Design a protein around this ligand. Structure first.
Ligand SMILES: CN(C/C=C/COc1ccc(C(=O)c2ccc(Br)cc2)cc1)C1CC1
Ligand SMILES: CN(C/C=C/COc1ccc(C(=O)c2ccc(Br)cc2)cc1)C1CC1
Ligand SMILES: CCCCCCCCOCCOCCOCCOCCO
Ligand SMILES: CCCCCCCCOCCOCCOCCOCCO
Lengths: 619, 619
């Protein structure tokens, strides 16, 4: 029955693999990427008429009937995302008269206009001269003077936010303005009677910071800022030292873009760092068959490759399958061997982790590391030497990354400060990188493959962490994946691996929860709204990935030979395409709960296969 | 008579010009470049068998019958140069038995062996483990803490020495060792009964520095060096901020090589800076028709282009000659507009100078700037706007670069410290960049083209400087050119331009000096030995360039219609080749008096033309 499904799913994944021997599916987000890119080109004075076209088709194509744009497909209209898309289009050529512009402008005004947008949005508009810098949260270069152990030092923020802060400190230090031609001016973003509904700091704002900010803007108007020069250089150098091999900065859109602007401000357009940083952008771009063009918020070659292997293995292919070997080999040349920012908290820890993208040595993450090591432990490479050695290095690194609460973070250790969550500037997405259930789970299952059970203290500490985090309904939150089905599926699958007794109460209470949300069509689904409204927790249209996750939870809990079990398997078998793939018009990935969502292209093919592979194991 | 000579010389230069519209002749030096490059590859673990071959052919080809190598063609054997060539060859494959190696080893031992070599030589050998670091002058990273106005701060050294010191401070901080395979070990460099004849600091050594050094080596053995870490980073950042656009550092061989090694020591082989720096090397390499390969100590595209223009103009071609326009345009896109290290002494000076090579924004020099501006002032470009503006910027910059003594340096202002000349480390070539007669002269002649005469104070201050520097025999020293004929030719030509009366006494005393050295064959020549022995002052085999220089001095002094005058002109006319070019088996360029000599490929074609052009003007 499901056999043909697997066989078809397998040959498909094998056809997606590149020559080098890795997998790499595009990462979807929202139009703010492309929109901001347009503004960036304007800033760097490097506009390409041809590209603009492709970007225009894209923007319109992603606009809904109401004339707005959302964070995820089928999601509510987003003000910020729309405002930025509006500005972008108008710059390219669109006239405020054309319908697309009209319906968009409407929604924008019905929300209070630009005064209701996030910080970044107002900041970008400030860079082009459509908004006063004075009304933008200030972030001084002096922040570079804070010591390793001081309130608000760059190392208390998340790896992703850190670089951004450093880059912007230079930008906000000079508060440059790159005027837009008259035809592009967007004053209409102000014309609104609706009261401005501003968004506050993530964890709430304190009058202290509020005052401090007001002070900073004041100190900004003075005629002399002692030691500011040094502060700027401190930031410039910080950036120059961590620039990624591909020319990026962290492998993410934000810091990369701001770093370039910063360099432009310091008249360093003819400096290697800049040149490389600029031309490196193309690698993240993507040509769309309908004439459009998009910019990936980030790339997941390693991540995809890793899962893809574990999927094909659990499917059936030999541990020494010549094709899977290519992957193994490839994955070995990716391992990092130099210290990263994580070393600031673990100076005596030996490098050995892996990154999300191709070349990003200074920012390896636990999640990727775990999956890559785990994936290798299931293969038979020609040179058992480096394979054995590699796993060892990565293994140890992961262990040394374990936080205090026994849980694991993504990039840093005990990065659980709370101060940054109250700063005026931080009002969008996460700002810190605390331990998460999903990451932890992946780690445990990684060790499990080796054998390390509940006996080992490290494992126990983690298990306890998970137990204390479990939700009342017996489910587990999903940090980097949408959502409770993602997390619960991870935990259970992990706990099962570490030797824990699947018969346990809290465990069962979880499995039951899964079955209770199985949609009528036999599959599982969870809309991204589950991050805003708890009512959607476990609710949503059925998707190949989410269905596979909830499926793994059951197969792991022994309920593989159950009704809901076989039921879900039926879904995957039917919904499968003639080529052996799967479709998924919805996002199942998460960047920042309630603020940024991702669309993992490979998920729809990988997980479904991994699930069917594990189901064929229970029988 | 000389007409045909000119017409042939012109069409030749025009055939050398590249498509872009510039000239670029290879720069010759000595085998230490290629030799050290081989060691560098060994260090960076990037040896290319094929390249090694080409490098071997070169080395042997440059070896004389006695089995040695010299700084300049026809010069005495050099210990350092030979030792490095010896080591290089042995690493490539040569056995110490083969004749070439034998005769070389001889000369080396007859000089006291490795103990008699310069600092760098012993240092390189120390990097490969053939010499103890303990016996190598120490240079601490802490040197980075010295303030702008303190004894021995990095800004008291010459631009060329500065970067080198910064890079090496990191290297000597870790004192790394990259062992050579047994077959390459060169212990024979010690086997010698001859007493070691060590070379001391350039300006003599003081027991202070001697003691200070002994102290530094002691502090180097301690278990804890407080703040050294910061010191290292201070250097790393300094380097990362000034890396040239082509990936080099200053556009010269030394710092470029050491910067790479330094980055290798800090495990930054996967950092953009390194990558760019490594692949950038190829641009300086050169394929030799006989199968050899050499590495240029530096490149002179701008310099060649500049002179080439002034030459063709003085020759006859129209100020708007479509071909010369290409040059003009090209030269305009080269002008620098950002601050360089020179700004540390002139913070309120507006950028506008030019560099020696293609892309080297942080290190423009007065000599190039002057010549480039002067060259432009003789052309009629389509966009008179940028031409007028460019000249203005460059003009002003030059003026703001004038030193105290009324003279002009090369890269910095009043870079006349004396402390660095006594440090143990500095025992090869110049270490500071004080004002020179030749540079100054070029500057004066640059202003002259505009009209500014002796009336202007700036001009007077310079003229006085020249008068006070003139040698007893009425000649002028040649800093960046070999030598007295080069300098005297420059000064006189300049003074004539600034309106000074050519009939003056000191002037005449100079012209006479010129005529007095005219070789029998009618031409002029000055061997590089003139820097060691004053007896060779003005003596040496006749060369196209030197003959042209002494010729300009006469033509400028009004003695154009003289015997010696017409005599020299005859030489150039006869010695000219069928293609219209000229040969010159000798070096006429100077890097460091008595230590480093250069071979400017274009000189033999440019100056001879410029001379004939100015002779055709006097008639
Ligand atoms: C390492 N893990 C989890 C992390 C995945 C990466 O996810 C992203 C990717 C990009 C962004 C932004 O572009 C962004 C946009 C706006 C701002 Br403000 C900042 C960053 C954000 C998050 C791998 C195994 C799955
Ligand atoms: C700007 N002017 C004058 C300067 C010319 C440049 O000349 C050089 C070039 C290279 C070197 C070294 O490689 C060197 C080798 C060994 C050490 Br130790 C340091 C540097 C040295 C000098 C132009 C108009 C003519
Ligand atoms: C990073 C702060 C930018 C403000 C300083 C730039 C002004 C240049 O100062 C001149 C000092 O001499 C150093 C020059 O080399 C410049 C490269 O450093 C990069 C740009 O700051
Ligand atoms: C330049 C001093 C050499 C010390 C480097 C050891 C690295 C210590 O890790 C610190 C953590 O910060 C991350 C740095 O890696 C970025 C590049 O900085 C250059 C050399 O590491």
């Amino acid at each position: 029955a499901y056999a043909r499904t697997l066989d078809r799913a397998v040959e498909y994944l094998l056809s997606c693999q590149k020559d080098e021997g890795y997998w790499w599916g595009p990462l979807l987000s929202n139009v703010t990427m492309e929109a901001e890119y347009v503004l960036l080109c304007h800033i760097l004075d490097r506009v390409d008429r041809d590209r603009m076209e492709k970007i225009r088709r894209y923007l319109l194509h992603e606009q809904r009937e109401d004339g707005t744009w959302a964070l995820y497909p089928g999601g509510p209209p987003d003000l910020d995302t729309t405002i930025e898309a509006y500005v972008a289009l108008k710059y390219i050529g669109m006239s405020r008269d054309e319908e697309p512009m009209q319906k968009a402008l409407r929604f924008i005004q019905s929300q209070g206009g630009i005064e209701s947008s996030r910080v970044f949005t107002r900041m970008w508009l400030a860079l082009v001269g459509e908004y006063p810098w004075e009304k933008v949260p200030m972030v001084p270069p002096e922040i570079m003077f804070l010591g390793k152990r001081m309130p608000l030092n760059i190392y208390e923020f998340g790896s992703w936010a850190r670089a951004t802060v450093v880059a912007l400190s230079i930008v906000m230090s000079r508060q440059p303005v790159f005027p837009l031609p008259e035809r592009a001016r967007v004053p209409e973003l102000y014309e609104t009677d609706v009261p401005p509904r501003r968004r506050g700091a993530k964890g709430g704002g304190g009058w202290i910071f509020d005052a401090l900010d007001r002070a900073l803007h004041g100190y900004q108007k003075l005629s002399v800022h002692p030691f500011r020069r040094a502060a700027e250089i401190r930031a410039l150098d910080w950036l120059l030292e961590r620039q990624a091999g591909d020319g990026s900065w962290g492998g993410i859109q934000p810091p990369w873009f701001y770093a370039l602007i910063a360099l432009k401000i310091l008249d360093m357009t003819q400096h290697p760092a800049f040149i490389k940083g600029w031309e490196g952008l193309e690698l993240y771009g993507v040509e769309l068959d309908y004439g459009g063009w998009m910019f990936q918020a980030s790339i997941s070659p390693v991540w995809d490759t890793g899962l893809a292997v574990l999927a094909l293995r659990a499917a059936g292919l030999p541990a020494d399958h010549d094709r899977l070997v290519k992957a193994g080999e490839w994955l070995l040349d990716r391992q990092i061997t130099v210290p990263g920012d994580w070393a600031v908290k673990r100076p005596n820890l030996k490098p050995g982790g892996f990154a999300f993208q191709f070349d990003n040595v200074y920012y390896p993450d636990v999640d990727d590391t775990a999956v890559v090591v785990w994936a290798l432990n299931t293969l038979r490479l020609p040179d058992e030497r480096r394979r054995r050695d590699a796993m060892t290095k990565g293994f140890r690194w992961i262990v040394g990354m374990q936080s205090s609460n026994g849980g694991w973070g993504a990039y840093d250790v005990d990065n659980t400060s709370d101060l940054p969550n109250h700063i005026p500037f931080c009002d969008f997405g996460e700002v810190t990188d605390p331990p998460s259930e999903d990451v932890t789970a992946h780690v445990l299952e990684c060790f499990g493959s080796f054998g390390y059970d509940d006996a080992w203290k490290v494992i126990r500490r983690a298990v306890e962490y998970l137990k204390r985090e479990q939700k009342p309904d017996g489910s587990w939150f999903g940090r980097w994946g949408v959502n409770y089905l993602y997390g619960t599926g991870a935990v259970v699958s992990a706990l099962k691996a570490v030797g824990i007794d699947t018969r346990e109460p809290y465990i069962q209470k979880a499995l039951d929860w899964v079955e209770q949300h199985q949609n009528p069509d036999g599959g599982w689904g969870e809309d991204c709204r589950s991050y805003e409204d708890p009512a959607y927790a476990g609710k949503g249209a059925s998707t190949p990935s989410q269905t596979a996750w909830a499926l793994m939870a059951l197969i792991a809990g022994g309920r593989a030979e159950s009704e809901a079990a076989r039921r879900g398997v039926q879904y995957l078998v039917e919904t499968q395409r003639p080529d052996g793939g799967w479709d998924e018009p919805y996002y199942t990935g998460t960047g920042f709960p309630g603020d940024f969502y991702l669309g993992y292209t490979m998920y729809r093919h990988v997980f479904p296969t991994l699930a069917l592979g594990r189901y064929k194991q229970a029988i």
